[PDB]
Symmetry: C3
Subunit: 90 residues, 3 copies
Amino acid sequence: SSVQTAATSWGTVPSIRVYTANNGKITERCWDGKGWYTGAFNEPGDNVSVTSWLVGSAIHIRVYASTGTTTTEWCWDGNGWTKGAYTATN
Amino acid sequence: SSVQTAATSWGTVPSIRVYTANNGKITERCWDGKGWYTGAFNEPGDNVSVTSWLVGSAIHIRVYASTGTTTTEWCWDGNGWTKGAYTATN
Amino acid sequence: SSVQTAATSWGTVPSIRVYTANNGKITERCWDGKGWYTGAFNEPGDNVSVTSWLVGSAIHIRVYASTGTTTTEWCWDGNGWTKGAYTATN
Ligand SMILES: C[C@@H]1O[C@@H](O[C@H]2[C@H](O[C@H]3[C@H](O)[C@@H](O)[C@H](O)O[C@@H]3CO)O[C@H](CO)[C@H](O)[C@@H]2O)[C@@H](O)[C@H](O)[C@@H]1O
Ligand SMILES: C[C@@H]1O[C@@H](O[C@H]2[C@H](O[C@H]3[C@H](O)[C@@H](O)[C@H](O)O[C@@H]3CO)O[C@H](CO)[C@H](O)[C@@H]2O)[C@@H](O)[C@H](O)[C@@H]1O
Ligand SMILES: C[C@@H]1O[C@@H](O[C@H]2[C@H](O[C@H]3[C@H](O)[C@@H](O)[C@H](O)O[C@@H]3CO)O[C@H](CO)[C@H](O)[C@@H]2O)[C@@H](O)[C@H](O)[C@@H]1O
Ligand SMILES: C[C@@H]1O[C@@H](O[C@H]2[C@H](O[C@H]3[C@H](O)[C@@H](O)[C@H](O)O[C@@H]3CO)O[C@H](CO)[C@H](O)[C@@H]2O)[C@@H](O)[C@H](O)[C@@H]1O
Ligand SMILES: C[C@@H]1O[C@@H](O[C@H]2[C@H](O[C@H]3[C@H](O)[C@@H](O)[C@H](O)O[C@@H]3CO)O[C@H](CO)[C@H](O)[C@@H]2O)[C@@H](O)[C@H](O)[C@@H]1O
Ligand SMILES: C[C@@H]1O[C@@H](O[C@H]2[C@H](O[C@H]3[C@H](O)[C@@H](O)[C@H](O)O[C@@H]3CO)O[C@H](CO)[C@H](O)[C@@H]2O)[C@@H](O)[C@H](O)[C@@H]1O
Ligand SMILES: [Cl-]
Ligand SMILES: [Cl-]
Ligand SMILES: [Cl-]
């Protein structure tokens, strides 16, 4: 078995984010044009997906983290990661 | 083992779609700015990926669903889900 | 167990790429509006993710391929696939 990743990118630079689900934990590596660095995102999960969009130069990222049948959305909206409205019945 | 997701988003709102492969079936949860709701997409699959693009304000989504070595593209083009041209030799 | 895919798309056509991790190897199927065809990308991996961005009409793709705890970035920047700066500590 391998680790599992999800990626997103924005802008002209570009900025890239790469999330890795590994042993029940999802972590983050970031590029803003000046070296890979380890980002603030650190939440539980066995599976991960991501999407992102820009509002002007401001980035909004949504990360879907899954453990068993439960998916939790994590929201970056410019200040920190907050838990999003997302619900499902899996 | 965990459920597996894939996500895409578009526009200023934004609209988001989140596909979940769970027990051989792929289902869909949608956001258009006014609550998560369960979308029309419901097709077989153990793995899922997605990409999407806008033609004006019209959304085109492509969902790649895999069972065993077979991938099937599903196409949203404004009216309903149709099976796309995609073929592979896995 | 199923094969595992990752998808990205760009432009008005659109062009689409679909990467499939199957039995330790990641391969690529491409659409540029005129039939699916098998692309140049062929590197080892059990898991795959992708993101892409346009600089004018030029496409930059980044493919994250994972085996065990090691992720390798592969870079398309208009000429061929090169191994990218990405590092992580998984
Ligand atoms: C998107 C966000 O990125 C990291 O957050 C750090 C933040 O990054 C800035 C970055 O310096 C800037 O060039 C980029 O274009 O936008 C980000 C802000 O949206 O910088 C702050 C301090 O200024 C902290 O270091 C943040 O942690 C990452 O850590 C977050 O998890 C998330 O991916
Ligand atoms: C896209 C959507 O985002 C959340 O929905 C909440 C919505 O999010 C605002 C957020 O407060 C703001 O920081 C950002 O600039 O824009 C978001 C909208 O794109 O805010 C509303 C009304 O205040 C509610 O709080 C929504 O729950 C997230 O919860 C959704 O699941 C979805 O990802
Ligand atoms: C993309 C498509 O979305 C759902 O389809 C439902 C459709 O959604 C509208 C939505 O109300 C609108 O705000 C959004 O911006 O575009 C969608 C149309 O492209 O609304 C119709 C009735 O008007 C039905 O409810 C559709 O089911 C989802 O169900 C589809 O699977 C797909 O994700
Ligand atoms: C992007 C491409 O989409 C399908 O290719 C078919 C192509 O799709 C049209 C579709 O009929 C139309 O509703 C939408 O507005 O635009 C699509 C092109 O982006 O149509 C052609 C010629 O009629 C063929 O029918 C193509 O098969 C899908 O089949 C491809 O695999 C790919 O996802
Ligand atoms: C993105 C790149 O695509 C394939 O590379 C082949 C390349 O494709 C062109 C394509 O014809 C053009 O319409 C598209 O818009 O841009 C691509 C160039 O960036 O064509 C060359 C010869 O001209 C070779 O056939 C390339 O292999 C794919 O093979 C690459 O792996 C990658 O996905
Ligand atoms: C986005 C970034 O791409 C690599 O970073 C290298 C950077 O890539 C250039 C590339 O040489 C060029 O062909 C393309 O047009 O633009 C890229 C930047 O977007 O080039 C710098 C300085 O020369 C370094 O060589 C960087 O390593 C990749 O290595 C990063 O991990 C990331 O994906
Ligand atoms: Cl670096
Ligand atoms: Cl809601
Ligand atoms: Cl074809």
